[PDB]
RNA sequence: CAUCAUUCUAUGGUUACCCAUCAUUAGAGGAAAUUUCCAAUAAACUCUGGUGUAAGGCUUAGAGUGAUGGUCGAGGUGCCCUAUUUAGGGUGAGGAGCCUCGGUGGCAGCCCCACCAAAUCCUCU
RNA sequence: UAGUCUGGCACGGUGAAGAGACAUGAGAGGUGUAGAAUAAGUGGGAGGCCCGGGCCGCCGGUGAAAUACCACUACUCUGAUC
RNA sequence: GCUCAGGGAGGACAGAAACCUCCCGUGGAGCAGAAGGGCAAAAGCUCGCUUGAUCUUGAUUUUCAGUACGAAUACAGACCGU
């Protein structure tokens, strides 16, 4: 947590890999690369009941705990890669996505570039569930 | 029981001269700790750098994988 | 049974009755240089297999509990063994049995 | 353990070069100790006897009312009776000066129990122990602590500091502060294996010298 | 649980407190005098008919439900 | 009548060493939630001795006197749950270890009342 | 008990790199209150110092214990090797 | 020092059975256990103090070969308890 970085105005970047599935939300800051990571706290790490692991509140608590951990190391700004469950599963990002991004837009982190890395298959394997689907 | 982030050297990422904006960002790496070397586990990192961050005033829908 | 940790009994060296300190006897560790254990290993070593009997037909379940009497008067400090009859349960000055007391 | 030097024990008259001071000097000595335990009963205590008058200069008080009154009147002693010892040892808490004042006391024989009251062993459990013996010898018995052995104790720094010699006496009894010191503290040996590495021989004050 | 046991007649110290410290206030109501000085509400009314005819209080409002007194005026 | 603090004494006290504490070794023991009881059950930690490490009165008996014919005041002291989290909502039992007469406010300092913490935590619930 | 598996010793050698040790020669290096003063720790000691002359002392005071000038070992990080 | 099992007669609550007295009470109870023997100012019951369940030579009895072991009986020398 001591870098020879110029301290005033010139920003120090990481990229936060916000992976919002429908049953958990992962706010995970890494470097510019992704190879070395900085902070990772999830929805389920904060709120201790399984149904509100994916709540937008649980994802907010995470991104607040991410951001204040990220200011100790002095990574000022964040690039963003938003991600849904993806593959053959759902491409619409989870409910915790926006609240978690807003949480480190309210914390004090500068926002770099936002994109989707939702692992979109060109052409997929077979999907879990039947011919007749997931009945209820 | 100990901080792993205590022992992170902070290295600069240079873009080749064909691009305008030189400095890309900052890459924390664990120091040489006996066998495994700082430069060793650093010489294959991809950087997904947008053109707008790399060339001065141009399109911001093009990215460039640059490896150390 | 139950034996008290104190016993005003005969001390051989003192030649009188003096108060002793009662403690349960245990075995010592077998010396590796006792003549029998030396003879054993010389015989046991090499080929021939087990040379002397291994007792297996274990019949009795309790010991003759032995007391290690120790003279309290600090010039003497002489000791002797005091073997008592076989008993399963055994304690040193546990809880004196009382009379006119309710068994609840 | 054995130092074994007795070879050509002179050249300690090279004193005018090692010294350029003026005053009362004490030719002190420190010994190299290795692999010793501070906390446990690793015991390095008692006294190592010198025969050859080292002459330690400290504040001495001797308690009695005997021949040792008029025997020590030829020493110029402050000889004191029992009815001045109460005000010496009453004020031990409030009065901010060091109350004992004099860095030696005494328990006698014929006065065997000098004082075993609350005003007595209050003194033998703060330092400066009333240790020196004055049985019925009655020929010196005062100056024979300032003329007798040098002392050593154990503490939790693994080291030792002791005063062996002096400026005042000639350089023939100061090698008898080596001869009758190192002949003992070699033979003074328990299983603190080969404790004597080497002997950092000193003047009072000056440049390094080596014997062993 | 907690049982407040007030004085029906004045302890010597409490009348020494009531005939000293009560006119030093800005209000004299028979419920504050009762609450504060550990005396009774009816007794605190009986105290202030006597201190009325001493001329050391000030009768501002008197009603059956609520009588109010205050300190004697500055001048 | 009880307990502590004080000095004065007493043929008294082991000084390479006494005692309160810190610790480990040597034994005895529960209320309650849970009902309808029965006899259990099963801790937490206290009491007395050894030994050992800082200061320095011991623990014995007599007398004078600190604070009470009756004392301390007499009050803070936990866990549990919650996106009212400098706050709100619970209500069980029984065990040892600590600031001092607080500061501020309101009719001020007394009587009251408010409001901000000191070290509390272990177990059968 | 054959064989089998396993560890050690010998045959059994060269060269580098890393690490944990350890001897050699060093710097930084300790803060119950309080004394004006980050009191490692003992043997000091009212005694020194330099260009005829001054300072650190001593006491006052915290504590079981206070420097100038002689040395050593306790013990925490760095750091060089025939 | 006491007398037990059991019975009779009484006595608030109290009944077939709690407790309290008086009377009868040869053992009809009890003495750790199997059974037999023994036992009433005791060998039982309740208290008091205790460690003779200690130390030591021999002899003897029981089984018996008249050998061991176990168990036992009379002494003797100590030291002890009551």
What CATH number is attached to the domain comprising A123?
Answer: 3.30.420.80
Which residues are A82's β-sheet partners? A116
A31/B25 touch (CB, cutoff 8 Å), yes or no: yes
List strand H contacts in C 2-61 (CB < 7 A).
Answer: 4, 7-10, 12, 15-17
Which chain F positions come under 7 Å from a protein C-beta? 8, 12-18, 28, 39-40, 55-58, 82-83, 107-112
* Chain A: closest CA distance from residue B16 (Å): 17
What is the Cα–Cα distance from B55 to A92, expressed in whole angstroms?
Answer: 33
Here the tokens at position D3 are 């130092």
> Using CB atoms within 10 A of its CB, is residue D107 exposed (0-12), middle (13-18) or buried (19+)?
buried
Residue listed under structure tokens 């009695």: D64
What is the Cα–Cα distance from D2 to D187, expressed in whole angstroms?
Answer: 8
Gapped junctions in chain E, after residues (C–N > 2.5 Å): none
Three-state DSSP at A88 gives coil
Quickly count: other Cβ atoms within 10 Å of residue D143's Cβ: 16
What is the Cα–Cα distance from D122 to D157, expressed in whole angstroms?
Answer: 27
What is the Cα–Cα distance from D34 to D192, expressed in whole angstroms?
Answer: 9
What is the Cα–Cα distance from D17 to D10, expressed in whole angstroms?
Answer: 15
What distances in angstroms separate CA D50 from CA A110, D53, D203, one per listed residue? 82, 7, 18
What distances in angstroms separate CA D158 from CA D39, D48, D152, D182, one per listed residue? 10, 18, 13, 19
DSSP state at residue E13: H
Alpha carbon B34 to its chain centroid, in Å, reads: 23
Our measurement of CA C104 to C1' F41, in angstroms, reads 14
What distances in angstroms separate CA D165 from CA A12, C89, D23, D203, E55, one per listed residue? 70, 72, 15, 8, 98
Q: Which of A1, A5, A35 sits opposite B26 (nearest CB)?
A: A5
* DSSP-assigned letters across all residues of D22-54: -S----EEEE---S--SSSS----EEEPPSS--
- Give yes or no for a contact between D174 and D165, defined as CB atoms under 8 angstroms apart: yes
Q: In terms of residues, how long is chain A?
A: 136
- Structural domain range at position A34: 2-136
- Give yes or no for a contact between B67 and B46, defined as CB atoms under 8 angstroms apart: yes
Three-state DSSP at A38 gives strand
What is the Cα–Cα distance from A116 to A135, expressed in whole angstroms?
Answer: 30
What is the Cα–Cα distance from D34 to C56, expressed in whole angstroms?
Answer: 57
CATH topology assigned to domain E4-73: Arc Repressor Mutant, subunit A (1.10.10)
List strand F contacts in D 102-131 (CB < 7 A).
Answer: 113, 116-118, 121-122, 124-126, 129, 131
B45/A4 touch (CB, cutoff 8 Å), yes or no: no
Our measurement of CA C69 to C1' F22, in angstroms, reads 36
E18 closest CA partner among E59, E75, E58, E57? E57
Q: Is residue C87 marked as binding?
A: no
What distances in angstroms separate CA B24 from CA A81, A134, B21, B63, B68, one per listed residue? 17, 47, 8, 12, 12
Three-state DSSP at D144 gives coil
What is the Cα–Cα distance from D107 to D66, expressed in whole angstroms?
Answer: 13
Three-state DSSP at A6 gives coil
Q: Is the CB of D209 under 7 A from strand G?
A: no
- Chain B contacts of A34, Cβ < 8 Å? 46
Q: In terms of residues, how long is chain E?
A: 75
Our measurement of CA D23 to C1' G45, in angstroms, reads 11
What is the Cα–Cα distance from D177 to D182, expressed in whole angstroms?
Answer: 8
- Chain B contacts of A32, Cβ < 8 Å? 13, 24-27, 47, 49
* Chain A: closest CA distance from residue B32 (Å): 15
B5/A73 touch (CB, cutoff 8 Å), yes or no: yes
Our measurement of CA E9 to C1' F7, in angstroms, reads 49
D166 closest CA partner among D128, D196, D203, D199? D203
Q: Is residue C11 marked as binding?
A: yes
Three-state DSSP at B65 gives strand
Q: Residue D67: in which H helix or E strand, if any?
A: helix D67-71
Structural determination approach: cryo-EM
- Give yes or no for a contact between B24 and B13, defined as CB atoms under 8 angstroms apart: yes
A12/B25 touch (CB, cutoff 8 Å), yes or no: yes
Alpha helices in chain C (DSSP H): 35-44
Residue of A35, A80, A111 to mutate, testing the B interface (most B Cβ within 10 Å of its Cβ): A35
Q: Is the CB of D38 under 7 A from strand F?
A: no
Q: Residue E15: in which H helix or E strand, if any?
A: helix E12-18
What is the Cα–Cα distance from D103 to A109, expressed in whole angstroms?
Answer: 71
What is the Cα–Cα distance from D146 to D57, expressed in whole angstroms?
Answer: 7
Our measurement of CA A48 to C1' F88, in angstroms, reads 20
How many domains are contained in chain A? 1
Please check whether residue B5 touches A, CB under 8 A.
yes
* Chain B: closest CA distance from residue A135 (Å): 41
Three-state DSSP at A97 gives helix
For chain B, first and last CA: distance in Å? 32
What is the Cα–Cα distance from A84 to A95, expressed in whole angstroms?
Answer: 10
- Chain A contacts of B29, Cβ < 8 Å? 36
Q: Which of B3, B6, B29 sits opposite A36 (nearest CB)?
A: B29
- Give yes or no for a contact between D69 and D79, defined as CB atoms under 8 angstroms apart: yes
Instruction: Considering all nucleic acid strands, name the nucleotide whose C1' atom is nearest to the C-alpha of residue D126.
Output: G64
Our measurement of CA C94 to C1' F33, in angstroms, reads 34
Quickly count: other Cβ atoms within 10 Å of residue C7's Cβ: 15
A12/B6 touch (CB, cutoff 8 Å), yes or no: no
What is the Cα–Cα distance from E67 to A98, expressed in whole angstroms?
Answer: 65
In chain B, the residue whose alpha carbon lies closest to the alpha carbon of A81 is: B48
């Amino acid at each position: 947590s001591l870098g020879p970085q110029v301290a005033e105005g010139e920003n120090v970047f990481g990229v936060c890999h916000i992976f919002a599935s429908f049953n958990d939300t992962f706010v995970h800051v890494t470097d510019l690369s992704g190879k070395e990571t900085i902070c990772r706290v999830t929805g389920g790490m904060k709120v201790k009941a399984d149904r509100d692991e994916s709540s937008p509140y649980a994802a907010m608590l995470a991104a607040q705990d991410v951001a204040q951990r990220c200011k100790e190391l002095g990574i000022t700004a964040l690039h963003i890669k938003l991600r849904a469950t993806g593959g053959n599963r759902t491409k619409t990002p989870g409910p915790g996505a926006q609240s978690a991004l807003r949480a480190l837009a309210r914390s004090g982190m500068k926002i770099g570039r936002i994109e989707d890395v939702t692992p979109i298959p060109s052409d997929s394997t077979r999907r879990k569930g039947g011919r007749r689907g997931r009945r209820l | 029981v100990v901080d792993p982030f205590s022992k992170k050297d902070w290295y600069d990422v240079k873009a080749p001269a064909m691009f305008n904006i030189r400095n890309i960002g900052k890459t924390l790496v664990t120091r040489t700790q006996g066998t495994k070397i700082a430069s060793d586990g650093l010489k294959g990192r991809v950087f997904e750098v947008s053109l707008a961050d790399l060339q001065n005033d141009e399109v911001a829908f093009r990215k460039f994988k640059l490896i150390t | 049974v139950n034996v008290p940790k104190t016993r005003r009994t005969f001390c051989k060296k003192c030649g009188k009755h003096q108060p002793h300190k009662v403690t349960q006897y245990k075995k010592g560790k077998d010396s590796l240089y006792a003549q029998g254990k030396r003879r054993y290993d010389r015989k046991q070593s090499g080929y021939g297999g087990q040379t002397k009997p291994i007792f297996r037909k274990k019949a009795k379940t309790t010991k003759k509990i032995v007391l290690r009497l120790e003279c309290v008067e600090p010039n003497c400090r002489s000791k002797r063994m005091l073997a008592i009859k076989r008993c399963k349960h055994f304690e040193l000055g546990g809880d004196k049995k009382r009379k006119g007391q309710v068994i609840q | 353990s054995r130092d074994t030097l007795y070879e050509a024990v002179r050249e300690v008259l090279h004193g005018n070069q090692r010294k350029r001071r003026k005053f009362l000097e004490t030719v002190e000595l420190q010994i190299s100790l290795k692999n010793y335990d501070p906390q446990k009963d690793k015991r390095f205590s008692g006294t190592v006897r010198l025969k050859s008058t080292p002459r330690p200069k400290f504040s001495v008080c001797v308690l009695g009312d005997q021949q040792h009154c008029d025997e020590a009147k030829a020493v110029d002693i402050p000889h004191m009776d029992i009815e001045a010892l109460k005000k010496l040892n009453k004020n031990k808490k409030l009065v901010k000066k060091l109350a004992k004042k004099y860095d030696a006391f005494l328990a006698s024989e014929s006065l065997i129990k000098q004082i075993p009251r609350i005003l007595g062993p209050g003194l033998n459990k703060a330092g400066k122990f009333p240790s020196l013996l004055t049985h019925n010898e009655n020929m010196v018995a005062k100056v024979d602590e300032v003329k007798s052995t040098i002392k050593f104790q154990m503490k939790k720094v693994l080291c030792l500091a002791v005063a062996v010699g002096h400026v005042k006496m000639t350089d023939d009894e100061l090698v008898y502060n080596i001869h009758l010191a190192v002949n003992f503290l070699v033979s003074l040996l328990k299983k603190n294996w080969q404790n004597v590495r080497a002997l950092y021989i000193k003047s009072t004050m000056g440049k390094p010298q080596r014997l062993y | 649980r907690d049982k407040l046991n007030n004085l029906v007649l004045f302890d010597k110290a409490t009348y020494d407190k009531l005939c000293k410290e009560v006119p030093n206030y800005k209000l004299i109501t028979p419920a504050v005098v009762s609450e504060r000085l550990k005396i009774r509400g009816s007794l605190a009314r009986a105290a202030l008919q006597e201190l009325l005819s001493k001329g050391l209080i000030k009768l501002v409002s008197k009603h059956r439900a609520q009588v109010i007194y205050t300190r004697n005026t500055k001048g």
